[PDB]
Design a protein around this motif. Structure first.
Motif, PDB file in Angstrom:
ATOM      1  N   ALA A   1       0.891  -1.081   0.126  1.00  0.00           N
ATOM      2  CA  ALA A   1      -0.015  -0.086   0.055  1.00  0.00           C
ATOM      3  C   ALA A   1       0.950   1.146   0.130  1.00  0.00           C
ATOM      4  O   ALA A   1       1.428   1.649   0.952  1.00  0.00           O
ATOM      5  CB  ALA A   1      -0.976   0.089   1.178  1.00  0.00           C
ATOM      6  N   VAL A   2       0.683   2.032  -0.988  1.00  0.00           N
ATOM      7  CA  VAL A   2       1.555   3.435  -1.163  1.00  0.00           C
ATOM      8  C   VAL A   2       0.408   4.304  -0.920  1.00  0.00           C
ATOM      9  O   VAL A   2      -0.668   4.312  -1.577  1.00  0.00           O
ATOM     10  CB  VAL A   2       2.215   3.533  -2.508  1.00  0.00           C
ATOM     11  CG1 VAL A   2       2.666   4.839  -2.689  1.00  0.00           C
ATOM     12  CG2 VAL A   2       3.320   2.488  -2.735  1.00  0.00           C
ATOM     13  N   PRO A   3       0.542   5.330  -0.070  1.00  0.00           N
ATOM     14  CA  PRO A   3      -0.297   6.341   0.481  1.00  0.00           C
ATOM     15  C   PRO A   3      -1.005   7.198  -0.876  1.00  0.00           C
ATOM     16  O   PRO A   3      -2.086   7.148  -0.823  1.00  0.00           O
ATOM     17  CB  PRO A   3       0.105   6.818   1.580  1.00  0.00           C
ATOM     18  CG  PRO A   3       1.507   6.878   1.391  1.00  0.00           C
ATOM     19  CD  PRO A   3       1.965   5.484   0.751  1.00  0.00           C
ATOM     20  N   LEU A   4       0.020   7.914  -1.141  1.00  0.00           N
ATOM     21  CA  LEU A   4      -0.289   9.073  -2.383  1.00  0.00           C
ATOM     22  C   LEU A   4      -1.352   9.935  -1.998  1.00  0.00           C
ATOM     23  O   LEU A   4      -2.573   9.965  -2.312  1.00  0.00           O
ATOM     24  CB  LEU A   4      -0.716   8.255  -3.656  1.00  0.00           C
ATOM     25  CG  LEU A   4       0.244   7.203  -4.230  1.00  0.00           C
ATOM     26  CD1 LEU A   4      -0.166   6.637  -5.328  1.00  0.00           C
ATOM     27  CD2 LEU A   4       1.634   8.008  -4.702  1.00  0.00           C
ATOM     28  N   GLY A   5      -0.971  10.746  -0.824  1.00  0.00           N
ATOM     29  CA  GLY A   5      -1.996  11.709  -0.536  1.00  0.00           C
ATOM     30  C   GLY A   5      -1.424  12.419   0.930  1.00  0.00           C
ATOM     31  O   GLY A   5      -1.139  11.584   1.592  1.00  0.00           O
ATOM     32  N   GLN A   6      -1.632  13.873   1.076  1.00  0.00           N
ATOM     33  CA  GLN A   6      -0.922  14.337   2.319  1.00  0.00           C
ATOM     34  C   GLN A   6      -1.853  13.503   3.710  1.00  0.00           C
ATOM     35  O   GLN A   6      -0.688  13.348   4.532  1.00  0.00           O
ATOM     36  CB  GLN A   6      -1.399  15.768   2.093  1.00  0.00           C
ATOM     37  CG  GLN A   6      -1.181  16.635   3.273  1.00  0.00           C
ATOM     38  CD  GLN A   6      -1.252  18.076   3.283  1.00  0.00           C
ATOM     39  OE1 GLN A   6      -1.948  18.655   2.453  1.00  0.00           O
ATOM     40  NE2 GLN A   6      -0.948  18.762   4.437  1.00  0.00           N
ATOM     41  N   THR A   7      -2.936  13.529   3.490  1.00  0.00           N
ATOM     42  CA  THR A   7      -3.786  12.840   4.718  1.00  0.00           C
ATOM     43  C   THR A   7      -3.156  11.353   4.938  1.00  0.00           C
ATOM     44  O   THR A   7      -3.079  10.998   6.216  1.00  0.00           O
ATOM     45  CB  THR A   7      -5.339  12.893   4.651  1.00  0.00           C
ATOM     46  OG1 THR A   7      -5.384  12.144   3.603  1.00  0.00           O
ATOM     47  CG2 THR A   7      -5.628  14.364   4.316  1.00  0.00           C
ATOM     48  N   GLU A   8      -3.152  10.632   4.061  1.00  0.00           N
ATOM     49  CA  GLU A   8      -2.781   9.236   4.045  1.00  0.00           C
ATOM     50  C   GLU A   8      -1.244   8.993   4.326  1.00  0.00           C
ATOM     51  O   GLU A   8      -0.811   8.289   5.087  1.00  0.00           O
ATOM     52  CB  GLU A   8      -2.993   8.406   2.963  1.00  0.00           C
ATOM     53  CG  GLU A   8      -4.423   8.394   2.744  1.00  0.00           C
ATOM     54  CD  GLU A   8      -5.218   7.500   1.783  1.00  0.00           C
ATOM     55  OE1 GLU A   8      -4.175   6.986   1.061  1.00  0.00           O
ATOM     56  OE2 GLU A   8      -6.289   7.184   1.332  1.00  0.00           O
ATOM     57  N   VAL A   9      -0.481  10.076   3.837  1.00  0.00           N
ATOM     58  CA  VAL A   9       0.946  10.091   4.236  1.00  0.00           C
ATOM     59  C   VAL A   9       1.308  10.336   5.649  1.00  0.00           C
ATOM     60  O   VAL A   9       1.920   9.884   6.518  1.00  0.00           O
ATOM     61  CB  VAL A   9       1.884  11.096   3.209  1.00  0.00           C
ATOM     62  CG1 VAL A   9       3.118  11.358   3.887  1.00  0.00           C
ATOM     63  CG2 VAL A   9       2.020  10.382   2.062  1.00  0.00           C
ATOM     64  N   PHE A  10       0.528  11.285   6.167  1.00  0.00           N
ATOM     65  CA  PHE A  10       0.554  11.904   7.660  1.00  0.00           C
ATOM     66  C   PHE A  10      -0.006  10.890   8.653  1.00  0.00           C
ATOM     67  O   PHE A  10       0.661  10.379   9.479  1.00  0.00           O
ATOM     68  CB  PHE A  10      -0.361  13.056   7.883  1.00  0.00           C
ATOM     69  CG  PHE A  10      -0.366  13.444   9.107  1.00  0.00           C
ATOM     70  CD1 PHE A  10       0.707  14.153   9.766  1.00  0.00           C
ATOM     71  CD2 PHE A  10      -1.425  13.442   9.919  1.00  0.00           C
ATOM     72  CE1 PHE A  10       0.902  14.598  10.944  1.00  0.00           C
ATOM     73  CE2 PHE A  10      -1.255  14.021  11.175  1.00  0.00           C
ATOM     74  CZ  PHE A  10      -0.316  14.519  11.790  1.00  0.00           C
ATOM     75  N   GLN A  11      -1.040   9.887   8.277  1.00  0.00           N
ATOM     76  CA  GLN A  11      -1.502   8.833   8.868  1.00  0.00           C
ATOM     77  C   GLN A  11      -0.526   7.719   8.853  1.00  0.00           C
ATOM     78  O   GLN A  11      -0.099   6.894   9.941  1.00  0.00           O
ATOM     79  CB  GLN A  11      -3.001   8.260   8.438  1.00  0.00           C
ATOM     80  CG  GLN A  11      -3.926   9.109   8.536  1.00  0.00           C
ATOM     81  CD  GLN A  11      -5.235   8.639   8.083  1.00  0.00           C
ATOM     82  OE1 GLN A  11      -5.400   7.424   7.313  1.00  0.00           O
ATOM     83  NE2 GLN A  11      -6.366   9.215   8.321  1.00  0.00           N
ATOM     84  N   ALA A  12       0.353   7.402   7.735  1.00  0.00           N
ATOM     85  CA  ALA A  12       1.406   6.391   7.809  1.00  0.00           C
ATOM     86  C   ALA A  12       2.514   6.896   8.516  1.00  0.00           C
ATOM     87  O   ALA A  12       3.008   6.041   9.309  1.00  0.00           O
ATOM     88  CB  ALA A  12       1.814   6.134   6.110  1.00  0.00           C
TER      89      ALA A  12
END
Lengths: 54, 41, 51, 337
Positions: free
Chosen positions: D4-15
């Motif tokens: 799973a690659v996040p690709l997005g500011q919110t999902e990068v912050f959650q990762a």
């Protein structure tokens, strides 16, 4: 196979217990599953079966 | 099922202080532990 | 199952006994200490009488 | 391997938050069916443990059924009662209902804060001890003092002052002293609840068999067998005989141990290493079972009646995941936060 061999590496039996009716087929039972992993003969059967397949 | 001196009982029961006598043990397990640490002290 | 629970409890009790006994065996004996205390008490009484 | 690659500011912050997560506390429900995990960020996850251990189990069943923000600072301690979940957060203890935390409401029962020295730090609460035989709760933390609170009314009865630095852990053994407390100062202290005084002090760093001056003097973990004690942390993992205060045996391990407990006839330990350490009471290393975290901070035996199927060992530490041991030789699975 890599997950099962990881479990076999990580359990590490390290067993004079054997110093103190024949079961022909495997017992595919959900409830046991741990008395077989504590044995060494079951591990020998599975590793021999891997070697025969390879 | 494989595993690996003493004091006279009345002398032990009448000489030890009640902190080390452990009158609640009057179980054999805590009795033997009381004998052991009384021998140590 | 009941007998093996009792067996592991007795094994824990034996290991506690061995754990105390090993610490006791770092100390010298009891009766030999009583003999040397009696000898030292007699020698101390003689030295106190001489003093 | 990067599934799973996040690709997005919110999902990068959650990762990034999942990558930098530490799980401090664990608690179990009154039934065996639920688990509660405290968070670095002050959050609480609730794990359907019976649903995870079921035969019908999905990959989304190893997820929190309810996670919620509960404290401003980190959740350093949980404890559970017959009906409540007590959680010590920033500097105060909140209470939550097991019946209502599964629902959408998620309100608190109370909010109690012990009296302080009014210093400008708002000290932590490291250990929660739930005392039976009387409805009480012992608070211990950066105030270097033991506070006793009634569970029915929020009044604080006893204040105990024996330590020099702050406290890491508490214990209970149901005798006349009945309360052990170990701290950063390096001494296990005994606290009789009746006289509200200190009756015995065991300094573990003073004994040369245990010292190890490289790591320092701090006691992270205690355990009771009502006659014995296991003390570990900075100095060494040592077995003390109470009423004698003598170091009986030493457990030969290099890493400092953050938690210890008594099993049936084993000693379970976890610390800065990766694996769970299974010792025999004589002092022989019986096993080392590797976990998924680089370090562990909490163990929990889920020995509860009316749910024998939820009898596992749960481990947590410097990760965003909890290792569940259905057997003591290998991990079965791990619950993501």
């Amino acid at each position: 196979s890599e997950e099962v061999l990881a479990v076999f590496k990580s359990y590490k039996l390290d067993d004079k217990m054997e110093e103190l009716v024949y079961f022909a087929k495997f017992l595919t039972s959900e409830k046991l599953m741990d008395l077989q992993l504590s044995d060494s003969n079951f591990r020998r059967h599975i590793l021999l079966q891997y070697l025969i397949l390879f | 099922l494989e595993f690996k001196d003493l004091v006279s009982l009345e002398e032990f029961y009448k000489e030890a202080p009640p902190d080390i006598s452990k009158a609640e043990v009057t179980d054999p397990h805590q009795q033997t532990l009381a004998r052991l640490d009384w021998e140590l002290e | 199952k009941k007998q093996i629970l009792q067996a592991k409890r007795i094994r824990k009790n034996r290991q506690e006994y061995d754990a105390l006994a090993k610490v006791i065996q770092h100390h010298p004996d009891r009766h030999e200490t009583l003999k040397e205390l009696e000898a030292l008490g007699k020698e101390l009484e003689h030295l106190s009488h001489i003093k | 391997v990067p599934l799973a690659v996040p690709l997005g500011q919110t999902e990068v912050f959650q990762a990034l938050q999942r990558l930098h997560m530490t799980i401090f506390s664990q608690s179990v429900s009154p039934c065996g069916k639920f688990l509660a995990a405290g968070n670095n960020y002050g959050q609480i996850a609730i794990f359907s443990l019976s649903s995870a251990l079921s035969s019908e189990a999905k990959e989304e069943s190893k997820k929190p059924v309810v996670t919620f923000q509960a404290h401003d600072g980190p959740v350093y301690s949980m404890v559970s009662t017959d009906r409540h979940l007590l959680s010590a957060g920033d500097g105060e203890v909140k209470a939550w209902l097991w019946a209502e935390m599964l629902k959408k409401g998620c309100k608190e029962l109370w909010r109690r804060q012990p009296p302080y020295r009014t210093s400008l730090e708002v000290p932590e609460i490291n250990a929660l001890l739930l005392v039976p035989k009387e409805n009480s709760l012992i608070l211990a933390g950066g105030d270097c003092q033991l506070h006793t609170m009634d569970l029915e009314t929020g009044t604080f009865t006893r204040v105990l002052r024996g330590h020099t630095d702050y406290i890491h852990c508490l214990a209970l053994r149901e005798r006349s002293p009945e309360v052990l407390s170990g701290g950063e100062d390096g001494a296990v202290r005994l606290w009789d609840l009746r006289t509200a005084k200190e009756v015995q002090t065991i300094e573990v760093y003073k004994h040369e068999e245990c010292s190890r001056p490289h790591n320092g003097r701090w006691i992270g973990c205690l355990a009771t067998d009502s006659d014995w004690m296991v003390c570990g942390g900075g100095p060494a993992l040592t077995l003390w005989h109470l009423r004698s205060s003598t170091p009986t045996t030493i457990f030969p391990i290099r890493a400092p141990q953050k938690h210890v407990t008594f099993y049936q006839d084993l000693i379970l330990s976890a610390g800065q290493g990766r694996c769970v350490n299974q010792w025999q009471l004589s002092g022989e290393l019986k096993a080392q079972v590797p976990g998924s975290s680089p370090g562990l901070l909490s163990l929990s035996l889920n020995q509860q009646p009316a749910a024998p199927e939820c009898k596992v060992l749960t481990a947590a530490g410097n990760s965003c995941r909890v290792d569940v041991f259905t057997n003591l030789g290998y991990r079965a699975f791990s619950l993501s936060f």
